[PDB]
Design a binder for this molecule. Structure first.
Ligand SMILES: O=c1ccn([C@@H]2O[C@H](COP(=O)(O)OP(=O)(O)OP(=O)(O)O)[C@@H](O)[C@H]2O)c(=O)[nH]1
Ligand SMILES: O=c1ccn([C@@H]2O[C@H](COP(=O)(O)OP(=O)(O)OP(=O)(O)O)[C@@H](O)[C@H]2O)c(=O)[nH]1
Lengths: 285, 285, 290, 290
């Protein structure tokens, strides 16, 4: 049922500078590969088949990464390095397609999603914010848990995670009666942006993963900058909308410390370099 | 009904070299603008709303041309040149979208179209070969004549034009009982590629404009290189397929002489420079 | 003798839109190649060895033009188009180097030439404005003549061409005593911008070809007007006047301004006709026009 | 004294895939900036003024890094992030020029340095391999020491570092008589590639930092092996031996090979810890690991 995902990648990264000065914030290297690969992986391992990049003129290198590189391939055949040729050819299955649409101007997330309207048509769809990485410890990643819940419930889904009470002021936070269990959804009434450290209706931050109906493109055409949460509220007035509580862990690769935490955590766990990396950490003091 | 058009632009141009050495053959300048603009114009003036570029890693400059250029725009505001700012902002209507999908490898036109399968879905669609320019003398361009004929007849359409008998050997040529009139279609049985100057079943060359059903994506998955005409033949075995005979004139911007003929002909007729150009020609001898 | 040339190619090409919305002005097709090829050819046929491109972050396609393209070469081999592959491989003699340096911000032509300071060092150099094409010549080209002149005289050289009396307000024209003969120089004491139709000191227009000494870099670092128009080349040449002779060289040849849309079409026509292979078939296309 | 450095940065980065599939190896994030920033910093802190990038047609992002980004600057202004805008504006001292020349085909390191011939001219120059980071130092850095050494002695200088006896087969190691002290040089008579574990002429590894005279360009034009491995730098330095002293300089500091995936992670760790702002909070992330 849910086969399309919008990845809004058009935004420059003022928060991961100068790393992203001359390359997309999404192509910054997490262990041995760009951060966007962990996000595209996440989508594909949860049944996506059309990755829709809403992109900017400065970000060919993102499209290129999921395309074939003639000169680099046919100097891994001139040399005899077919292990590597495997790492640059088979990034996503033959049946997964990567599409591009440009965001003319940076008029917000809701505007980004709306640029995708031509491509999503009547299909429901996932939204995945590339600067957030999500790490699963099971065999069903939180995007898949969330999609199967959309599929049965037919309620829009918004991935959330609890934050310390003293930082609710840094995040979108959901208006929810009771906090659901790790892995399940509750009904939600709306999102409060950056509520003061006293007056939040939960400790559950909007993490940056959504499943939404085609309907919302209409809603986005008619908001009071176009911001997503406005269209999500407008959705309240017709349908049920649930907040999904993730089982996994997040890293904001936008913040310098969230990216250094992603390198450490994803590195300890790399198939090959994990044990040799664990070693390099031990040798430090 | 017919709202999507596939523009296969992934092919390098060995025939317009060195012009296209470091820029796409499609961005070569015809009077005062890239050749791709005449083709996108053609599609939009005939009711297209999703231009689908099947593209290559070397061709960002094509996507860029239909996107906004921050630094160039906001030094036409620092300067006070709003006539020009009009020529770089309003290339295609707000409601026309430009989509990109990459052709991994150059496995032929039929492969190019098939790369578009994710985006076309069940919709019927137009195919427009960018290195051919088409010039109309009426108020209905041959792509529009051809689309309205698909719409009523439900028969796939293949734009054709008559060639001298001594050059049938340079072109795809249609197998057709009688030649239709300029502006109308006949039934056709197949295309013969480059038949010898004796044994052609008509003098009507395949010009490089099609209207096809979604069906053909299935057909293209199952051809004996994947070449379009094979899938078109396979279509014969189920549906009627008509050859449309254009009222207009062509220029192959692929050949050095067809491009010099496009500059002359399109230049004599430029809103502003037409009369000043006509002048420059007169002054020559 | 003179081995180095600065091509300032960092402009956003506002005069030639939308053609240059998304590719350099310098990569516009004149017949069958980009304009920049005709300017590099001209330099090279005058013994220039080092082409110094003062460039902008979107002008990679200029640099790619004089470099080798793997995927393009290998598709030409696979099609056994060997003469073509030989042409797109030898764009510049093998002894010719193409360098790049960035113009950080677009502060005009003197600031652009100042950006080549480190690559020019103590050498004397030509400047070629790439938006001007200069065609025609019996033997050696106008740039060669003007260089042999800089070599003998050791006077800065500024290429000028005679314009009709009623258009001298469209041009920088030079303060000279008498107009020299075609292919000769004369001392000049200033250039006036868009002089008034009545009273201009000659009919000889500044063309966009210079031979200057390294000295000029030090002068470009000490010309005012930094916030108004930023660094003006004519102001630095004015300062050179104070210690050094400066001469106006008069072309034998004929220029074409591929900055205007209408000068571009003049060039396509004139180069088209003279094209060694298409010229005759292109004349044929013209005749057939009515 | 020594004002010029060639950074050969034209490789396709096969050792560091898929990280470098679609961005230069040289633009890989080490903590919070690309690797190339650390190599340019090092050169500059040793009085290098002209950075000469020998580059490939896909390495624009390297050149864009040391240039100004209009759209990026104007979005930083609109967000009143003025300290950041000041940082991304002054990446290199204002007296430092970054030049580019293309390596037409990938024929190895001597062919790359030969591509800088026209920009080096008669000047003596450093070569810095950008895939090697060199950290640490009490006062002036290893490259400064090695340059002041090239200045006094007028002997080609090759930076070497002591490796464990059982790994000398992973390295080019130098034929020296005695190993010098850290921060000192000694005459060397050859480098042997991956010498055998038993018998190597020292434990001092070639690091990828050189000070060479212009002479070497003429030698690089006359070293054989053109079709085998193409032009080898060690072959040209061997030929320099024939007329000129050549010395091995021993680092005070410590290198990191961001060509391997595992040397990259060493660098991130060691630079992370020493990062002037994140170091302490990054140590904190390590402690919390179990
Ligand atoms: O107009 C918009 C806004 C946001 N986004 C998407 O949302 C995120 C916005 O990325 P930003 O560039 O806005 O975030 P940042 O961390 O650099 O911080 P500031 O610039 O606010 O200081 C990115 O993931 C982007 O792709 C868009 O694509 N377009
Ligand atoms: O695999 C293919 C084949 C063809 N095409 C599309 O069809 C045309 C093929 O363009 P070509 O590059 O094949 O044509 P050319 O005129 O340069 O001649 P040769 O290379 O054959 O010598 C272009 O319009 C291209 O976009 C593709 O997009 N992909």
């Amino acid at each position: 049922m849910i086969k399309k995902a919008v990845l809004p990648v058009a935004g420059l990264g003022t928060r991961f500078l100068p790393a992203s000065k001359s390359i997309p914030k999404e192509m910054v290297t997490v262990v041995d590969r760009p951060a966007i690969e962990y996000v595209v992986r996440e989508a594909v391992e949860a049944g996506i088949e059309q990755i829709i990049l809403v992109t900017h003129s400065s970000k060919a290198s993102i499209e290129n990464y999921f395309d074939r590189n003639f000169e680099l391939e046919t100097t891994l055949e001139q040399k005899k390095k077919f292990d590597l040729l495997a790492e640059i050819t088979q990034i996503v299955p033959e049946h997964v397609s990567v599409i591009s649409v440009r965001q003319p101007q940076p008029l917000g997330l809701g505007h980004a999603v709306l640029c995708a309207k031509s491509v999503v048509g009547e299909d429901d769809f996932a939204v995945l914010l590339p600067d957030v990485l999500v790490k699963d410890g099971s065999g069903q990643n939180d995007l898949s848990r969330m999609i199967s819940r959309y599929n049965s419930s037919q309620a829009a889904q918004i991935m959330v995670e609890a934050v310390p009470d003293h930082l609710v002021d840094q995040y979108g936070i959901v208006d929810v009666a009771q906090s659901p269990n790790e892995g399940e959804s509750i009904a939600m009434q709306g999102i409060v942006e950056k509520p003061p450290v006293g007056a939040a209706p939960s400790n559950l931050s909007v993490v940056g993963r959504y499943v939404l109906p085609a309907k919302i493109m209409q809603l986005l055409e008619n908001t009071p900058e176009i911001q997503l949460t406005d269209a999500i509220a407008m959705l309240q007035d017709t349908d049920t909308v649930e907040a999904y509580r993730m089982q996994g862990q997040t890293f904001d690769c936008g913040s310098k410390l969230g990216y250094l935490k992603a390198v450490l955590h994803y590195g300890l766990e790399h198939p090959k370099l994990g044990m040799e990396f664990k070693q390099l950490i031990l040798e430090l003091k």
